[PDB]
Design a protein around this nucleic acid. Structure first.
Lengths: 91, 93, 93, 92
DNA sequence: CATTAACCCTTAACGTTAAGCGTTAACT
DNA sequence: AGTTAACGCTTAACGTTAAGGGTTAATG
């Protein structure tokens, strides 16, 4: 239930089109470990990257961004979620 | 029109709508006063641990705050390198 | 004999023992802030240069550190595809 | 102190002793011919992997290899940086 | 008070640099 | 054949700019 925006790039744009991380940052005109570290589930999706990524693969920008925010949000919960209702229950 | 910072929302639809204050709103979420204000001043963004805190406290889907941030972020990466990117990258089309 | 990042050693025997931070130690070694913070979070490794600054400051042999990094990489490699490597290579006997 | 590439070792006291040639070794180890040879020539080091394969093949500890490389790495950092690091740092 | 400009720690994303790979195609 | 360019991919380590966050203080 936390899916990295990475896994999605790899498991379906890279692999589908048989593009390498090295070749992708070459198209995106960003450096090599930029695209590689997002692929490895070690970096996230900046908004500069979701603009590049969406431009290339013909998708909306938010699509990457919302792939991110579900990853970031899943990860704040299950780290501190219940330790927050026991903190703020108000309205 | 496009860039609108999630703070602008917290004032105008939640604080301004409930006669609530920042120092007041820090206390509820159980975080520091300078973090609620700096969002409200529009000099800081929504983190996920934040959006969970505002989500729970205003009976809001946490995905709504992060989306307010989601867009405001893209808005300003366009218009800062928007024309740059569109020139550097040709699609897979 | 099992996989322990050297970073684990750094906080559990040194930082916590002498009440120092990542940020404070990095200033004392003359490296930038995440060069020490990343080792502590078990996300970067002890390079020779890092292993020599660590030696000096904490009056230890640099070998000490480079062997905590030796063990960590070995154990990482093995099982990642040890046995498998044992299952590809006859020795000379 | 003095630096000694782990190649020197695998060559002098391993590959000369047992009449194995680099491109032979590469095979038994199931690794490409330029890794073993680039290690012999002293232009590449022993990765954590290589250690394990060389150690397996030669009935030694993968440690043994990494320690050779720990020490070639150290002696090379020192000297190239040794002094100014001791000078810009003060212990406790 | 409630709000701020002070710092300080930690930490994400970026471009550089450079090291280990295998693949290929030379040479020796 | 063995030895080795010379490609290209991956991936580690670094300084750096800059973000969120809680101290504290100054302010209003």
């Amino acid at each position: 239930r936390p899916i990295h925006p990475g896994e999605i790039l790899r498991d379906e744009f890279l692999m589908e089109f048989d593009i390498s991380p090295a070749a992708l940052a070459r198209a995106l005109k960003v450096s090599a470990p930029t695209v590689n570290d997002i692929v490895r589930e070690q970096r996230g999706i900046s908004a500069d990257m979701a603009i590049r990524l969406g431009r290339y693969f013909d998708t909306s920008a938010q699509f990457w961004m919302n792939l991110q925010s579900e990853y970031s949000l899943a990860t704040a919960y299950a780290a501190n979620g219940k330790q927050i209702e026991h903190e703020i229950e108000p309205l």
